[PDB]
Amino acid sequence: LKSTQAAIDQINGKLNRVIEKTNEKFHQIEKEFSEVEGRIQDLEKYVEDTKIDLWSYNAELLVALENQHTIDLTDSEMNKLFEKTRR
Amino acid sequence: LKSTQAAIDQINGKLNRVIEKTNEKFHQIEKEFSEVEGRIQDLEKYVEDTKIDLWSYNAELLVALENQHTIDLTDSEMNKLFEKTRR
Amino acid sequence: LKSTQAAIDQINGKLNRVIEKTNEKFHQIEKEFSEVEGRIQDLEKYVEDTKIDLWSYNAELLVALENQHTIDLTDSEMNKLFEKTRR
Amino acid sequence: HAVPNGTLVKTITDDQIEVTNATELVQSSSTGKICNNPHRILDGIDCTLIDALLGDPHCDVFQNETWDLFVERSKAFSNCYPYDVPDYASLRSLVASSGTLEFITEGFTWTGVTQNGGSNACKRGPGSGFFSRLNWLTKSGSTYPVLNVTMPNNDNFDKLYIWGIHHPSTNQEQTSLYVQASGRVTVSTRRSQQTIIPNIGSRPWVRGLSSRISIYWTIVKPGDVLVINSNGNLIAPRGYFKMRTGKSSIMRSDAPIDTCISECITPNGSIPNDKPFQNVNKITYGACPKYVKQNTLKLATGMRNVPE
Amino acid sequence: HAVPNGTLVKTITDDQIEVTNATELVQSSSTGKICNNPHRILDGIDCTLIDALLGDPHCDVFQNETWDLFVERSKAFSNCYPYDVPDYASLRSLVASSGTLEFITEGFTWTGVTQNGGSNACKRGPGSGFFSRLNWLTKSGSTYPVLNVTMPNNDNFDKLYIWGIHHPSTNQEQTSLYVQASGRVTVSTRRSQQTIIPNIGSRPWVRGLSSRISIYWTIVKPGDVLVINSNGNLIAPRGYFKMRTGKSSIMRSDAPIDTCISECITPNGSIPNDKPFQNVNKITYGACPKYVKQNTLKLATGMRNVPE
Amino acid sequence: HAVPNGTLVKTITDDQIEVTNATELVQSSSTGKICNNPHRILDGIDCTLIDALLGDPHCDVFQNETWDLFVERSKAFSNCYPYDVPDYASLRSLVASSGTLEFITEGFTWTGVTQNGGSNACKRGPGSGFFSRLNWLTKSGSTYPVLNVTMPNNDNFDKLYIWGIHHPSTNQEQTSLYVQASGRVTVSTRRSQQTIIPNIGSRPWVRGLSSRISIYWTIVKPGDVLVINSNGNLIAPRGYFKMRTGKSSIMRSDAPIDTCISECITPNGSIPNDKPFQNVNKITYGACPKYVKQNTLKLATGMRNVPE
Numbered sequence A, B, C: 001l002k003s004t005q006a007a008i009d010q011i012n013g014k015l016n017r018v019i020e021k022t023n024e025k026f027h028q029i030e031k032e033f034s035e036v037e038g039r040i041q042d043l044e045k046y047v048e049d050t051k052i053d054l055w056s057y058n059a060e061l062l063v064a065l066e067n068q069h070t071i072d073l074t075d076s077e078m079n080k081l082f083e084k085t086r087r
Numbered sequence D, E, F: 001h002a003v004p005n006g007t008l009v010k011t012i013t014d015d016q017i018e019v020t021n022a023t024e025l026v027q028s029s030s031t032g033k034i035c036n037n038p039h040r041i042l043d044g045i046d047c048t049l050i051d052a053l054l055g056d057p058h059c060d061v062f063q064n065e066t067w068d069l070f071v072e073r074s075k076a077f078s079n080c081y082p083y084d085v086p087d088y089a090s091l092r093s094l095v096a097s098s099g100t101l102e103f104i105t106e107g108f109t110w111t112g113v114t115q116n117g118g119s120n121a122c123k124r125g126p127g128s129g130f131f132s133r134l135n136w137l138t139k140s141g142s143t144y145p146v147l148n149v150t151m152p153n154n155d156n157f158d159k160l161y162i163w164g165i166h167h168p169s170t171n172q173e174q175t176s177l178y179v180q181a182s183g184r185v186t187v188s189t190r191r192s193q194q195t196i197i198p199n200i201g202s203r204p205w206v207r208g209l210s211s212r213i214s215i216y217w218t219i220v221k222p223g224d225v226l227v228i229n230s231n232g233n234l235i236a237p238r239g240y241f242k243m244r245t246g247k248s249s250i251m252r253s254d255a256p257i258d259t260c261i262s263e264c265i266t267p268n269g270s271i272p273n274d275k276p277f278q279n280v281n282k283i284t285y286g287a288c289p290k291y292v293k294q295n296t297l298k299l300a301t302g303m304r305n306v307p308e
């Protein structure tokens, strides 16, 4: 009973933590071109592509690590209860 | 006595580690404009804003993880000592 | 015997995981310049330098964390076996 | 406990571990409809922002309007004098950031020159027409004299002025329209000055005409003075536009409008913002979550499922 | 267990911890040789891409060729009319992204003007020569009449056109070469138009000549029409180039060629891509790992070495 | 152990956990004063770098000076001929990166033209004056002949040359100052050439004058030759500047100077660099820590405080 509510507190804190807004934008760079303009097109597309790739990376390890911590806690309490049952 | 000096070694290594200089700049892009110039202003401001945001993010998880490790060690030794006291 | 094959599974999964390709580029921004052109040179060099620095940072913590997890597991099983030997 | 059906999730330890429950934080799709609450949505069905500013005859309904997010349908098209917008994106984003169409008329003096010129390519009804916010200046009788108009700014805000330079097709057209063999128009403020000279030449015949118009804009600050000098080929403004500061943007879309109340608008419709990540699109408006490239970010919400 | 020789690695806990084994994921160096499998490698030994496009006499061998990664040796040099490439990087990257040299001739009509002009600075053999893809237009007898060549696009792909504007050294040279005292050349499509006027003046004497040529390019879409107007100092194309979409790039290198099958090519040679990181270079081609600034990224592959 | 007063810190587990001790790594503020050790600080109180380079009469004290970090007070202002710096930031950062004012004179030959022109708008004392590093060339008697001056570079370093092009107000002013109805000035090296033509017109009357000057700069490499050609409206240099490579920058500030020894300088004063992060400003100079947006980064330095 204690483990269930404890893990619930864990994931619910994790949830209401990670769902935060840290992004605020009104108007950005042009993501879409109709013709070929020159070097400025390269600058624009490259910076925005690097931005989206880096954000995807950030997200990737965010979920990776949080899931890892959830594993560590759940399997830790799992072996603990297995020990106390196999005294 | 051993736990106190051990934890001291921990945080002091962590400190003299994270305080490293990895940034070296002499002259950078213009962060301040007096009038409206055009698309180049968008390029400049966007790249520098993305840079500062990404650096703040990096810092965020740096402190997050290091604090997490300090927790893991301190509460681990806490339950260990509670166990050895409640034999 | 079980610990050796377990740790082998650990590092081999870690390896075949981290070696993934997530980068695909055909043509990029011009890093080299022969003369001084103006502000566009600043934009170009700054964005690419920030990119390489951020990628190096990403790599840094990747190896840092993975090595950390390998430590945690190996020293955990180390104290476990020391305990079972010093009953 | 244990369940006969677990959920597989990605980890760093093993690529797919089975737990008892998980969640699907990533928003997967949109409803398809955009809807206008609490935002003020104005539908530019067949005319974009610039055509609304110039005053095209087929979109004279959109006048003195405000909005929170202007939309641009792919079916937009122009029905007036052919033109070109030098550095179009800058002025588009500038006018899009304001969000208003408060056009305040101004009394101008055009001596010796004939105003209100029109062409059959911009028929506002049964007869020839022109733009509503612009005035075509022409010669009167036997000459086109030099013009030096001045307008001050005694207010406490900024003013937007639009003007145009006419590029004829032939030198005979120029001479018959302006006695001067060559044209020149200078806009000037106390800190910003520009000069434009027309270009006689043949252009791709669009709507049955080769002559062109080039539009330019100017911003006047409080206490600044705007001076216009001309000797031929000038399209003068009829007033100015008041500048504001607010949360106004633009988004090209083709989705229909509904009556939902929602703070997140995307070109593919609306989505709820009760989630941290979404994979519908990167281009969002208002309070919208992080954009990623992964639609299957699963979050383990239960213990490891070890069935009996 | 324990071993008498461990491996020191970097950590966040302590700067150097000793474990029983480690790995060296970072690729340290290259073999020095670049090799052409499964990629199609073409060696531009002494002429770069632009000289291959213009048709220099010393590189007439490279004609109607395709490639996957063009190389540019530092020993490249030109042996023809001096020139300048306005915005050189854009056109270089554009032609480099195509990867083909399919040049399709086109029938042009040049009335009243003398074609196929040459100079001793571009001798293609024993006599005077010129570029293979360009034609020098000159006056015939006593006049250089105005030109207006039109060419449509009835196909379903894009066409590339190259042209040049001649800058003479003296006004007498201009008048003797073109009766018109001043030149002007206008290229036009249904959406893109440009106009160039020559510049009479003295330039640094290169290969014994002060006159210059400026090259420009144009892209024609399906259904579009290309119109050329001229009155003097025009170098006309002899055809067009078909545009494609593929994985084609360029890389300046000086390494020799081998026969190894490898998907990763670097300017310093080839490297295997069986590793996640490398420190040879940032500029890579094909499937190549992440670039970093650290060559000593060690990964602990064993337990902590605690010797007896 | 336990203490009655703990410290609350942010975690990922719980938002605020209480431990026995913590630290405040972030630097919170500055002392307000900038001070000049071990750096060489030069105070440009009322004249910026460009005015120090041109040689304004009110800042003739700053001559042949070196520095490590130049400061620009907001009270700076010019007291000479009105001007414009085309692409000002580039030349500002270029001269700021050098850090020296070693001006080496050069012997020039100006045939048929009158040198050392001045105006009452730049009075260096009781009489009319001009810039110290520039020379105003004018006609002599009845003509302004063409000038073709040449200067080589036999040294092993780079040279900086400054020059100016005069824009008159009226055509009569141009003709009376230079007999040529139109002007043209060409700067040339073996690889870089530029040409400027003056612009006759009216400008905002500043300090009682409408005429203008446009400044340009040129870099000469070892073995290169600088050629200047002119026919009117040229402001010639009197020498050159030697280029160096070092750690020199600029920073606009209004803080007073002190005698501290410190390696970190900010526009709001100096700060110690014994910490990994600071929140004073992002624009720093020298060894200064990481910039962040959070001023409350607490680091737990003790066990969890569980009072009795």
Ligand SMILES: *[C@@H]1O[C@H](CO)[C@@H](O[C@@H]2O[C@H](CO)[C@@H](O[C@@H]3O[C@H](CO)[C@@H](O)[C@H](O)[C@@H]3O)[C@H](O)[C@H]2NC(C)=O)[C@H](O)[C@H]1NC(C)=O
Pocket: D202, D204, D205, D206, D207, D208, D209, E148, E149, E150, E225, E227
């Ligand atoms: C040089 O050649 C070009 C291309 O042929 C000529 O441009 C073409 O000029 C004709 C003139 O009749 C255009 O026809 C007109 O089209 C408009 C479309 O709005 C129509 O309203 C008129 O009634 C007429 O049909 C044609 O569109 C135009 N473009 C093309 C691709 O043909 C150009 O005039 C020639 N210049 C000369 C004569 O030197």
Ligand SMILES: *[C@@H]1O[C@H](CO)[C@@H](O[C@@H]2O[C@H](CO)[C@@H](O[C@@H]3O[C@H](CO)[C@@H](O)[C@H](O)[C@@H]3O)[C@H](O)[C@H]2NC(C)=O)[C@H](O)[C@H]1NC(C)=O
Pocket: E204, E205, F148, F149, F150, F225, F227
């Ligand atoms: C204005 O000043 C420039 C700068 O020197 C003069 O340019 C120079 O012109 C001479 C032409 O006699 C070039 O000399 C050439 O040398 C080669 C090699 O011996 C020779 O074969 C040619 O016949 C010629 O003599 C000289 O290289 C060139 N200087 C530069 C910078 O390249 C220019 O001539 C001057 N204007 C006048 C009045 O000539």
Ligand SMILES: *[C@@H]1O[C@H](CO)[C@@H](O[C@@H]2O[C@H](CO)[C@@H](O[C@@H]3O[C@H](CO)[C@@H](O)[C@H](O)[C@@H]3O)[C@H](O)[C@H]2NC(C)=O)[C@H](O)[C@H]1NC(C)=O
Pocket: D148, D149, D150, D227, F202, F203, F204, F205, F208, F209
């Ligand atoms: C077209 O109208 C504009 C706005 O009225 C004119 O600009 C202003 O012209 C007057 C007369 O030239 C300038 O007054 C000047 O003051 C200076 C300084 O005392 C004096 O040296 C001049 O002789 C003259 O009295 C006024 O400053 C100027 N606007 C500014 C700069 O604020 C413009 O001149 C008119 N068109 C012409 C004549 O080009």
Ligand SMILES: *[C@@H]1O[C@H](CO)[C@@H](O[C@@H]2O[C@H](CO)[C@@H](O)[C@H](O)[C@H]2NC(C)=O)[C@H](O)[C@H]1NC(C)=O
Pocket: D028, D029, D030, D266, D267, D268, D279, D280, D281
């Ligand atoms: C959100 O709106 C965009 C706007 O079109 C939708 O776009 C595209 O999605 C299709 C489906 O794979 C792709 O083929 C196109 O290339 C996309 N257009 C782009 C990237 O410009 C998108 O599908 C919408 N989101 C959802 C979840 O439907």
Ligand SMILES: *[C@@H]1O[C@H](CO)[C@@H](O[C@@H]2O[C@H](CO)[C@@H](O)[C@H](O)[C@H]2NC(C)=O)[C@H](O)[C@H]1NC(C)=O
Pocket: E028, E029, E030, E266, E267, E268, E279, E280, E281
């Ligand atoms: C990969 O190719 C590059 C291309 O030259 C090699 O380049 C340089 O390395 C030397 C050795 O320190 C430096 O002095 C140069 O400054 C480098 N040139 C640059 C950065 O443009 C590089 O050495 C090659 N990689 C390896 C592992 O040899």
Ligand SMILES: *[C@@H]1O[C@H](CO)[C@@H](O[C@@H]2O[C@H](CO)[C@@H](O)[C@H](O)[C@H]2NC(C)=O)[C@H](O)[C@H]1NC(C)=O
Pocket: F028, F029, F030, F266, F267, F268, F279, F280, F281
């Ligand atoms: C460091 O110097 C800067 C330079 O002015 C100081 O600047 C500003 O801080 C005030 C206080 O909130 C803001 O209102 C301004 O907008 C800031 N100016 C900017 C961002 O350009 C700053 O306060 C100084 N640091 C400290 C700790 O005082």
Ligand SMILES: *[C@@H]1O[C@H](CO)[C@@H](O)[C@H](O)[C@H]1NC(C)=O
Pocket: D004, D005
């Ligand atoms: C999958 O899980 C659901 C939810 O309990 C269950 O009803 C269903 O029988 C399961 N299916 C299988 C094949 O286990």
Ligand SMILES: *[C@@H]1O[C@H](CO)[C@@H](O)[C@H](O)[C@H]1NC(C)=O
Pocket: D021, D022, D023, D301
């Ligand atoms: C699994 O979690 C979701 C919320 O993430 C919840 O709605 C659902 O009831 C859970 N499953 C069970 C069997 O309780």
Ligand SMILES: *[C@@H]1O[C@H](CO)[C@@H](O)[C@H](O)[C@H]1NC(C)=O
Pocket: E004, E005
């Ligand atoms: C280093 O390790 C190797 C590998 O076992 C071993 O042969 C060698 O003797 C060791 N050297 C020292 C000095 O420990």
Ligand SMILES: *[C@@H]1O[C@H](CO)[C@@H](O)[C@H](O)[C@H]1NC(C)=O
Pocket: E021, E022, E023, E301
């Ligand atoms: C150490 O690891 C490498 C692979 O990373 C392996 O080839 C080597 O055999 C290992 N060392 C020993 C002593 O097994």
Ligand SMILES: *[C@@H]1O[C@H](CO)[C@@H](O)[C@H](O)[C@H]1NC(C)=O
Pocket: F004, F005
């Ligand atoms: C806060 O901590 C200080 C440091 O020991 C102590 O002197 C003080 O009494 C504490 N205050 C409270 C309200 O606990």
Ligand SMILES: *[C@@H]1O[C@H](CO)[C@@H](O)[C@H](O)[C@H]1NC(C)=O
Pocket: F021, F022, F023, F301
């Ligand atoms: C808390 O840590 C600081 C250094 O971070 C130290 O100066 C202080 O003495 C510590 N507090 C106590 C009660 O020891």
